[PDB]
Design a protein around this ligand. Sequence first.
Ligand SMILES: COc1ccccc1CC(=O)N1CCO[C@@H](C(N)=O)C1
Ligand SMILES: [Zn+2]
Length: 140
Amino acid sequence: SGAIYVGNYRVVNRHLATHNDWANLVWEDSSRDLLVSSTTAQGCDTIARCDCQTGVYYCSSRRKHYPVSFSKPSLIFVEASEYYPARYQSHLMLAVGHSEPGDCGGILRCQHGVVGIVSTGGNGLVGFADVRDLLWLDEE
Ligand SMILES: COc1ccccc1CC(=O)N1CCO[C@@H](C(N)=O)C1
Ligand SMILES: [Zn+2]
């Protein structure tokens, strides 16, 4: 589990969104596994606006943050899971690292701020849903 709290937005994996998230919906995209809902309180996270390919992510199944090198956001075939059939997920970045299903939501960050959240995994890989192109998270 896990979310990004920036401004009056909450960014979560679409497959982990709650009824309150759907009832206060700002934007959602199944092909990216992302959903954004509105919040009453202002958050403290800031979004990275860069093309870094190195950063650090939180892994809840190890209670640890790991440094990683990750690929640029792209269209990748992801195997079937409990939440989606096997399909192409867009804006996904891959790294070598530990991830279990419940690790979804962990933040990936670089020197500039939050880059994305854990979305996929398996066999020593971890995939992150990028948020650096969502410029509207910084305003309104
Ligand atoms: C954290 O992912 C792991 C890790 C190890 C093994 C399996 C998973 C589960 C997984 O790949 N999912 C969860 C549901 O959403 C899927 C998606 N975003 O397409 C991806
Ligand atoms: Zn950066």
